[PDB]
Structure formats: C-alpha cells, structure tokens
Point group: C3
Chain length 231, copies 3
C-alpha cells in the first residue's frame, strides 16, 4: 500500500453488504473492523470472522487497487488470537487498536510472522499509554501508519469530547510529532457528526495543520471532504 | 478518603473561624492551608500552627466522613519541618505544594512515616519541574491525588494567565495524562474570579473534558458548580 | 550580551545596506543572517560571507553596546564550515538553526572552541527533533538562548500555519518549559504579517503568557511592539 493514505473508511466486519459497498466513494484505504464495530461476545466475534474473511477476499478481487485492511481486536483481548486466522497476505495491512508499548507492537509483529502473515501494522494510539509511548510504539519496524483515536483517548482519561478538541490537542500534537520522528504516516481523528460537512471541514483543517497526512472516515461522504485537505 | 474528590475547598490555616464554616457548602474535601493563605513571616507561620491544629482536630470530629486535609509549606521551605508537628493521624491526608521530583515525594513520605503520621499525599504540581516530572512524582506510592496549580506554574515560567488558559493547556493536559497512567486522582485549577459563575462553569467544563476528576475551590459557591461537572 | 533579549532583529547577510540600518530601532540584539535570508546556492552563500563579515565588524565599531550575532547555516548543511570564517571573537554570539540533538550543539561549541571563538550559542529549535529534544539541546552549557521557529517546525511536520497557532501550541509550550528548566532564555516565534501591529500584538501576548522572555523580529517596527510585552 502507499505510504500515504488520505482517507481510511471503516465498515463492520460482520456486514458483508457494507464491506462490498466500501469502494463506492473511492477511499485510499478501507478497514473491515472486527473490534468496535462488532459486539464484545465470544459468539459475535467468532461469527464475524468468516464473514469478514470472505468479504475481504471478494473486495480485493473486485477493487484490485484498493488498499484493504482488517482491524483485529486488541492484543490483550480474548479475541486477538482467533482474529489472526482472518488475515491473508493479500491485505495491505492489519490495524491493531489500543497499542500501548513498543513491546506490544513487537509481539504483534512476531505473532504475524509465525502465522506466516507478514502484514505492515497500522497502529492505534487511543489510550493514555498509547499517546505517552507514541514514539516507542511507532519506532517498531513493522509499524507503517498510526491513527490517534480521540474517542477512546478521552474515555480512557475520564474526559469528554468537544467540537474544538482542545481537550485532545496535546495528545493529537504529540502523536503527529512522534509520527514525523519515526517516519510513520499519521492518520487524524474520526468525526462523529455525520450531518454537517462544515464540522468535518473545520476538524480536517486542524488535523492537516498539525501534520497528519490522512484522516479516518466513518461515512462515505467524509472521503471527498478528507481529500480536500490531505494529499 | 475517597479515591475521587469532586471538590476541594480551601481555608486559611490561621483563621480558626473560617475553618469551622468549611462544612457548609458540603464539599468532598477541605484544605486547612498553612502555605499561601498565610503571610510569609517566620512568626506568622509558627503562630498559625496551633490554630490550624486545634481547628482541624475539632473539625474532623464535627464531620467524621468529610475528607480533611492540611496543606503544609513546600518541602524546601523553612517551615516544612515544624509544619509536620501540626499533623495528626485523623487527617485524611497532607497537601504538599510545589513538588518537583519523585525523590522529593519519597522524602516527604519517609519523613511522615518517621513522625508516625500515616498520611496519603495530595501533591501540588505547580512549577515547571513539577509538570515536567509529573509522572515520576505521581508514581510514588504515597501520592493519592494531585492538583495542577496554574497560578504558580505561570509565575514559575514567567508567563501570564488568561481566561482561555491556552498558556497552560500543555501543562494541564500533561498532568491529566500522567495522573491517569499512575492511578492518581487529578484535581483541576483554581478560578480566582469569585463574581461570575459562568467563568467557573466554562473553566470547570474544560477541566472535566481533559480528564480531571475534581477541582480546587476557593469559595463555597464554587463547590455546587464543581459538582455540576465532576462526579 | 545580556541573559535577557526582549527583541532580536534580523537582516539579510548579503545586504550591507540593510545590515547598517540594524541599530536604528535599538533592538536588544541583531542577527546578520547567512541562512534563510540568503538563497540556497554555493554562489549566493559565498558572495554573502564577506559582506556579513565586514558589515558585522562595521556595526560593532559603530554601536559598541549592541549585541551583534551572525546566524550560520544548519550544522549538517554544506555551508556550515565556511560560514564559521565569518565569525569573530567580537560577536556577542552565533545563531545555529535547526539544532536537533544535544550532541549537535556540543559539536558546534567544540568547533567554536578550536577556532578561538568564545561565542555562546543561540539555538534554533524549529523542527520535530529540535522540539522533541529541546531540553537536551538547551542543557548544553554553551547554549544561552533558544528560539522556537514555528515556520520550519510546521514545514518539517508537513503541517500548516494559522493565525491562532493552535497547530504549534504543543511545541511552543514545550520549548518554553524546557527553557525554564535549563536556565535558557526562550525567544518567541516570528510574525510574518507586517501590515498590522495588532496581529503582532496578539501574537506577542500569546508568547509572553507561555513564558517566553523575548521575540524574534523581522521588521524594525516590531521591536517597539515586542518591548511592550517582554522585559
Ligand atoms: O470504528 C470506527 O468507526 C472509528 C474508530 O474505530 C476509530 O476512529 O478509532
Ligand atoms: O490557595 C489558593 O487559594 C489556591 C491554591 O493554593 C492553588 O490554586 O493551588
Ligand atoms: O529569517 C527570518 O526572517 C526569521 C527566521 O529565520 C525565523 O524566525 O526563524
Ligand atoms: Mg478507534
Ligand atoms: Mg497553590
Ligand atoms: Mg528560523
């Protein structure tokens, strides 16, 4: 995949239909999500694995030039292990959420290698420890890109999100700087307000000014908006 | 004392009458202050010790559940040593202002134990070094809560305070993050404007969004406002 | 040169005429610039050196009490070595842009010592690494002052500058804090807009609030304005 992704669009791993609609807006990359998008039960996570596996295969064959990623559950969740069975060399990479130390990313890299699944890692820095150890996490060789997850960050610190985002400015700035120092591409925060392009435009602008090279998108319409600011 | 304190109300150590009025606003915790609240004269300090002691003694008995703290003078001040003699096991904890190194916090903890005073420490992070070494200070076991003192922080850096507080956003964000990583309760900055409830409301909202679990209060009226945002 | 510089005014190193005007606004210090001010070709830099060298000399003889500095090119640039010949013992010091490690600053000090140039360093922290290692760079003994260059910082991170400057608040606050902790005087960012003193006034105000003790100036008119805020 390109070292630069201007837009990264998500779809629930257990929604074959939404996964297939992923290329419509032509995002630079997409993420079939087995984490947040799917219920936290052993049953839901198991049911989602074959669905996302086949959906990923179909998608890559239909849109050969689309960078396709799969987001697995956190390293320390009881789902990480079995999520790996979903991966294939055809994916552009694997998204690992809530990483918190360089050792965790190295563990991930080694486990992937032992499953014969050499996939670059798109690191999720979205907790206090992830931000604090941002540089150490991104210096792991296998980490090619990273996103700052404001939503989980504030939840982790017992904070609350605002439109301006001053409450995550410190964190968002640290991640962008650590990303520059390690040669890793930084992906900006999601925008949950889906009814106003203006709210998104203002947010993307802040992210661009900070040095992020791309932005996470949760709705197709945000893709075109993202391309007006990154790239 | 509770792990979380929504409000912490201050009262001058040498003002036995005000100390007694403390329970009125029903704050989660109160601080009998021998530091800033009293004049910096070797005589005005030694004269405040007996008044603070006797006032704290009677206050704790009058409201046994209420978390009662006494703020002593800085570790390297000429008053610290003698201030300790004022403390008692019945206190919920001791407030130590201007801590700047993990080593200073450990020193305080050791001295307290040697004086047979089992008191958890409420660390004052309000200087450049305090903020810089926030995590190292807060990881000391005896430290249970910590507050960011914007007033003395700006004074220490030669800065100046504003209503928006952007000049201490980096510092306030760093303390909140370090508090999370160490399991320490973070207490937000004071609001010196005692005539406008909107200034406090907006200020408290910023602290809450950043991850603070409580806020320092200098006037009984701010207590109710604090509980509107923290809890 | 005093430990405190409220204003530091720049002039192109290849303009003998502009350099001569430097003393008119009575800035606390002046900088004859061989770096950004002079085009990036071996021809333009070599042509600039004798002018900066002699103009600096004529300046010191005319204004004996003025702190005169020369800004050489970056340490790892192909012009650094030759730029050193422009320096003389009579200068108040030398500005070294884009410093990124403590070791780089020590290298400069060493090379200055072997040339018999007792010139303290005014370090330029204006790239991701410069900000990341701000404290280590400033703890180098010969570093007496440091400036934060928001322009090159955002360029280095691939961001964009805004009037409000929230995109560089993190870095600006960090440089100011590190300067306090190392005993180094921190100089605030340049203001490129010259048609409005109000834009400069608001900016200087932000810098002062964060703890900066002086501000870089690129137009003599900014000198008096800086003096209203610093000192
Ligand atoms: O799942 C989503 O839609 C967005 C997400 O995880 C994130 O921004 O971290
Ligand atoms: O004593 C006060 O009024 C305020 C105080 O200590 C602080 O903000 O740290
Ligand atoms: O060259 C200039 O005029 C200003 C400059 O380098 C800076 O602010 O770093
Ligand atoms: Mg997320
Ligand atoms: Mg205080
Ligand atoms: Mg510069």
């Amino acid at each position: 995949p390109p070292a630069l992704l201007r837009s990264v669009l998500f779809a629930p791993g257990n929604r074959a239909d939404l996964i297939a609609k992923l290329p419509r807006s032509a995002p630079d990359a997409v993420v079939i999500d087995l984490e947040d998008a799917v219920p936290g039960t052993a049953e839901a996570k198991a049911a989602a694995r074959p669905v996302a596996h086949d959906a990923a295969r179909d998608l890559i064959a239909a849109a050969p030039h689309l960078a396709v990623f799969v987001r697995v559950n956190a390293l320390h969740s009881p789902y990480f292990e079995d999520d790996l069975s979903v991966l294939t060399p055809e994916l552009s990479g694997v998204v690992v959420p809530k990483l918190e130390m360089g050792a965790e990313a190295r563990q991930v890299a080694q486990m992937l290698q032992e499953r014969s699944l050499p996939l670059p890692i798109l690191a999720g820095l979205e907790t206090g420890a992830g931000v604090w150890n941002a540089r150490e996490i991104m210096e792991v060789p296998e980490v090619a890109w990273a996103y700052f997850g404001a939503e989980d960050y504030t939840t982790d610190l017992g904070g609350k999100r605002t439109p301006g985002g001053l409450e995550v400015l410190y964190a968002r700035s640290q991640v962008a700087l650590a990303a520059r120092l390690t040669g890793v591409a930084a992906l900006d925060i999601v925008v949950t307000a889906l009814n106003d392009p203006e709210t998104f435009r203002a947010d993307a602008e802040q992210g661009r000014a900070l040095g992020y090279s791309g932005k996470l998108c949760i709705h197709p319409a945000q893709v075109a908006l993202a391309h007006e600011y990154f790239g």
